[PDB]
Motif scaffolding. Structure first.
Motif, mmCIF file in Angstrom:
data_model
loop_
_atom_site.group_PDB
_atom_site.id
_atom_site.type_symbol
_atom_site.label_atom_id
_atom_site.label_comp_id
_atom_site.label_asym_id
_atom_site.label_seq_id
_atom_site.Cartn_x
_atom_site.Cartn_y
_atom_site.Cartn_z
ATOM 1 N N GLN A 45 0.835 -1.192 0.000
ATOM 2 C CA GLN A 45 0.000 0.000 0.000
ATOM 3 C C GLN A 45 0.883 1.260 0.000
ATOM 4 O O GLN A 45 2.114 1.170 -0.012
ATOM 5 C CB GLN A 45 -0.947 -0.084 1.214
ATOM 6 C CG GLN A 45 -2.295 -0.729 0.878
ATOM 7 C CD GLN A 45 -3.360 0.340 0.671
ATOM 8 O OE1 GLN A 45 -3.944 0.838 1.634
ATOM 9 N NE2 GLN A 45 -3.642 0.735 -0.558
ATOM 10 N N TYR A 46 0.250 2.445 -0.032
ATOM 11 C CA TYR A 46 0.882 3.736 -0.326
ATOM 12 C C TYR A 46 1.509 3.732 -1.738
ATOM 13 O O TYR A 46 2.447 4.481 -2.008
ATOM 14 C CB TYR A 46 1.810 4.148 0.844
ATOM 15 C CG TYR A 46 2.547 5.473 0.719
ATOM 16 C CD1 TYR A 46 1.871 6.699 0.866
ATOM 17 C CD2 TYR A 46 3.933 5.468 0.483
ATOM 18 C CE1 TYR A 46 2.580 7.911 0.761
ATOM 19 C CE2 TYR A 46 4.648 6.669 0.363
ATOM 20 C CZ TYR A 46 3.970 7.898 0.498
ATOM 21 O OH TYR A 46 4.671 9.058 0.397
ATOM 22 N N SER A 47 0.973 2.901 -2.648
ATOM 23 C CA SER A 47 1.488 2.641 -3.987
ATOM 24 C C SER A 47 1.510 3.931 -4.816
ATOM 25 O O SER A 47 0.499 4.344 -5.387
ATOM 26 C CB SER A 47 0.714 1.474 -4.625
ATOM 27 O OG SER A 47 -0.690 1.673 -4.632
ATOM 28 N N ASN A 48 2.645 4.623 -4.815
ATOM 29 C CA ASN A 48 2.838 5.931 -5.435
ATOM 30 C C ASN A 48 3.514 5.753 -6.777
ATOM 31 O O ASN A 48 3.992 4.667 -7.106
ATOM 32 C CB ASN A 48 3.655 6.836 -4.495
ATOM 33 C CG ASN A 48 2.763 7.890 -3.884
ATOM 34 O OD1 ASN A 48 2.471 8.890 -4.532
ATOM 35 N ND2 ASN A 48 2.316 7.691 -2.659
ATOM 36 N N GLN A 49 3.615 6.843 -7.532
ATOM 37 C CA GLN A 49 4.635 6.951 -8.549
ATOM 38 C C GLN A 49 5.763 7.755 -7.928
ATOM 39 O O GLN A 49 6.672 7.192 -7.332
ATOM 40 C CB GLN A 49 4.070 7.519 -9.862
ATOM 41 C CG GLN A 49 5.150 7.520 -10.957
ATOM 42 C CD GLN A 49 4.556 7.340 -12.350
ATOM 43 O OE1 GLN A 49 3.689 8.107 -12.765
ATOM 44 N NE2 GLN A 49 5.002 6.340 -13.093
ATOM 45 N N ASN A 50 5.700 9.076 -8.022
ATOM 46 C CA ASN A 50 6.915 9.889 -7.930
ATOM 47 C C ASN A 50 7.399 10.022 -6.491
ATOM 48 O O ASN A 50 8.599 10.034 -6.220
ATOM 49 C CB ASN A 50 6.704 11.268 -8.553
ATOM 50 C CG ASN A 50 8.038 11.998 -8.608
ATOM 51 O OD1 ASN A 50 8.985 11.522 -9.226
ATOM 52 N ND2 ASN A 50 8.147 13.147 -7.971
ATOM 53 N N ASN A 51 6.456 10.088 -5.554
ATOM 54 C CA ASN A 51 6.741 10.094 -4.123
ATOM 55 C C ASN A 51 7.513 8.834 -3.718
ATOM 56 O O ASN A 51 8.539 8.909 -3.050
ATOM 57 C CB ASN A 51 5.428 10.211 -3.338
ATOM 58 C CG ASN A 51 5.609 10.957 -2.029
ATOM 59 O OD1 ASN A 51 6.691 11.028 -1.455
ATOM 60 N ND2 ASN A 51 4.538 11.540 -1.531
ATOM 61 N N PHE A 52 7.026 7.674 -4.168
ATOM 62 C CA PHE A 52 7.632 6.373 -3.937
ATOM 63 C C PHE A 52 8.995 6.302 -4.611
ATOM 64 O O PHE A 52 9.968 5.962 -3.944
ATOM 65 C CB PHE A 52 6.699 5.250 -4.415
ATOM 66 C CG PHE A 52 7.390 4.015 -4.968
ATOM 67 C CD1 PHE A 52 8.176 3.169 -4.156
ATOM 68 C CD2 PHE A 52 7.308 3.770 -6.350
ATOM 69 C CE1 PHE A 52 8.928 2.143 -4.747
ATOM 70 C CE2 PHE A 52 8.077 2.757 -6.936
ATOM 71 C CZ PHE A 52 8.889 1.943 -6.132
ATOM 72 N N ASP A 55 11.432 8.358 -2.638
ATOM 73 C CA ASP A 55 11.736 7.785 -1.318
ATOM 74 C C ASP A 55 12.614 6.541 -1.446
ATOM 75 O O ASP A 55 13.586 6.375 -0.715
ATOM 76 C CB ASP A 55 10.455 7.426 -0.556
ATOM 77 C CG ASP A 55 10.793 6.825 0.816
ATOM 78 O OD1 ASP A 55 11.443 7.534 1.620
ATOM 79 O OD2 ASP A 55 10.358 5.679 1.084
ATOM 80 N N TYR A 95 9.098 -1.969 -9.433
ATOM 81 C CA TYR A 95 7.740 -1.559 -9.148
ATOM 82 C C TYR A 95 6.807 -1.952 -10.276
ATOM 83 O O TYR A 95 5.815 -2.605 -10.012
ATOM 84 C CB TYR A 95 7.690 -0.056 -8.922
ATOM 85 C CG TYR A 95 6.327 0.447 -8.500
ATOM 86 C CD1 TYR A 95 5.953 0.402 -7.142
ATOM 87 C CD2 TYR A 95 5.450 0.992 -9.456
ATOM 88 C CE1 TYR A 95 4.732 0.957 -6.727
ATOM 89 C CE2 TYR A 95 4.226 1.543 -9.044
ATOM 90 C CZ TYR A 95 3.879 1.554 -7.678
ATOM 91 O OH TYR A 95 2.773 2.224 -7.269
ATOM 92 N N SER A 99 3.883 -4.350 -9.290
ATOM 93 C CA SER A 99 2.606 -3.682 -9.474
ATOM 94 C C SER A 99 1.759 -4.458 -10.483
ATOM 95 O O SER A 99 0.587 -4.703 -10.198
ATOM 96 C CB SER A 99 2.869 -2.231 -9.914
ATOM 97 O OG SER A 99 1.715 -1.419 -9.890
#
Length: 104
Positions: A45-52, A55, A95, A99
């Motif tokens: 979960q918290y499955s982001n693009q650019n934030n992930f 990080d 990812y 994903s």
């Protein structure tokens, strides 16, 4: 600082078109000094693009910089910027596969 992070396995090294003529070989002759893995947490979960992807890069770079600097192994600004870019592409690759498996 990790506690509950997982490192992904040895992977595809994305070739980076710097276009500066040295780096076409410097990124080869020393490719083994730059990580070929990505340190993160599972997709879950918290499955982001650019934030992930940032990080992920940050954590991976930060882990690597400490491991090398404590083995007495340094990096230039190019060496760091190379990791910052390459690890983005590597992390995006892992990812995009994970994903897919999640959302197949």
């Amino acid at each position: 600082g990790l506690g509950g992070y997982m490192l992904g396995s040895a992977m595809s090294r994305p070739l980076i078109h710097f276009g500066s003529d040295y780096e076409d070989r410097y990124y080869r002759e020393n490719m083994h000094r730059y990580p070929n893995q990505v340190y993160y947490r599972p997709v879950d979960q918290y499955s982001n693009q650019n934030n992930f992807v940032h990080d992920c890069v940050n954590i991976t770079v930060k882990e690597h910089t400490v491991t090398t600097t404590t083995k007495g192994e340094n990096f230039t600004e190019t060496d760091i910027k190379m990791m910052e870019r390459v690890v983005e592409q590597m992390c995006i690759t892992q990812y995009q596969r994970e994903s897919q498996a999640y959302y197949q």
